Design a protein around this motif. Structure first.
Motif, short mmCIF file in Angstrom:
data_model
loop_
_atom_site.label_atom_id
_atom_site.label_comp_id
_atom_site.label_asym_id
_atom_site.label_seq_id
_atom_site.Cartn_x
_atom_site.Cartn_y
_atom_site.Cartn_z
N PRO A 17 0.83 -1.21 0.00
CA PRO A 17 0.00 0.00 0.00
C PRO A 17 0.86 1.26 0.00
N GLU A 18 0.44 2.24 -0.79
CA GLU A 18 1.14 3.52 -0.90
C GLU A 18 0.18 4.66 -0.58
N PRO A 19 0.01 4.98 0.70
CA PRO A 19 -0.85 6.10 1.06
C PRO A 19 -0.22 7.43 0.69
N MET A 20 -1.09 8.41 0.48
CA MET A 20 -0.66 9.78 0.21
C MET A 20 0.22 10.30 1.34
N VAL A 42 -3.93 3.66 4.33
CA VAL A 42 -3.25 3.91 5.60
C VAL A 42 -3.43 2.73 6.54
N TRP A 43 -4.63 2.14 6.54
CA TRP A 43 -4.88 0.98 7.40
C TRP A 43 -3.96 -0.17 7.03
N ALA A 44 -3.89 -0.50 5.74
CA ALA A 44 -3.09 -1.64 5.31
C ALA A 44 -1.63 -1.47 5.70
N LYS A 45 -1.00 -0.38 5.25
CA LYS A 45 0.43 -0.17 5.51
C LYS A 45 0.75 -0.28 6.99
N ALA A 46 -0.03 0.39 7.84
CA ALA A 46 0.20 0.33 9.28
C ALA A 46 0.25 -1.11 9.77
N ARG A 47 -0.72 -1.93 9.36
CA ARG A 47 -0.74 -3.31 9.82
C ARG A 47 0.21 -4.19 9.02
#
Length: 180
Positions: A3-6, A128-133
């Motif tokens: 995942p690549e959040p802003m 943001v949820w994916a990357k964090a976890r």
């Protein structure tokens, strides 16, 4: 899937948007209190999940400051997302006596441009949820760790209506969201 959040780390919020962020966080607390008080919950010093007691069932001003952080940061982060995509955001009680008064968004209409904005917010929030976890070693263990595109439309309708409701709160609070 990575995942690549802003990257919101460089956007800076002026005082008017900081205050907007805090009135949103305040209203989402009231939405939460009305929801659960009508479910038969009441205030108690310690929280019991089967007898429906909880200590944050209080006027917003009598919440501890740590208890306000989560909503304030979430609201602030959504405003930053809206800003980093190139949108202007411009204009235009005792403890025992507490009745939550959340804004009514039933009749707030969103133009198509803002409906797609909501979709873009939901996507990034899922990111943001994916990357964090995924940073803490999770893997597809959750089946929602997928490209937003490859999520089931059951969950994708949930995230999008959460972001849609924040955009409505902004409009009902007198602000205008416009590209450029």
């Amino acid at each position: 899937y990575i995942p690549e959040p802003m990257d919101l780390s460089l956007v800076d919020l002026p005082e008017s948007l900081i205050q907007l962020s805090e009135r949103i966080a305040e209203n989402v607390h009231e939405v939460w209190a009305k929801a659960r008080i009508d479910e038969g919950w009441t205030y108690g010093e310690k929280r019991d999940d089967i007898h429906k007691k909880h200590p944050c069932l209080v006027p917003y001003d009598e919440l501890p400051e740590e208890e306000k952080e989560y909503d304030r940061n979430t609201a602030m982060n959504t405003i930053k997302m809206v800003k980093k995509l190139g949108f202007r955001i411009e204009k235009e009680e005792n403890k025992l006596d507490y009745i939550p008064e959340p804004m009514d968004l039933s009749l707030v209409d969103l133009p198509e441009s803002l409906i797609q904005l909501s979709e873009r917010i939901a996507e990034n929030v899922h990111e943001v949820w994916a990357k964090a976890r995924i940073d803490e070693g999770w893997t597809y263990k959750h089946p929602c760790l997928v490209p937003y595109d490859e999520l089931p439309e059951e969950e994708k309708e949930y995230d999008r209506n959460t972001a849609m409701n924040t955009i409505k709160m902004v409009k009902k609070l007198g602000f205008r969201i416009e590209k450029e």
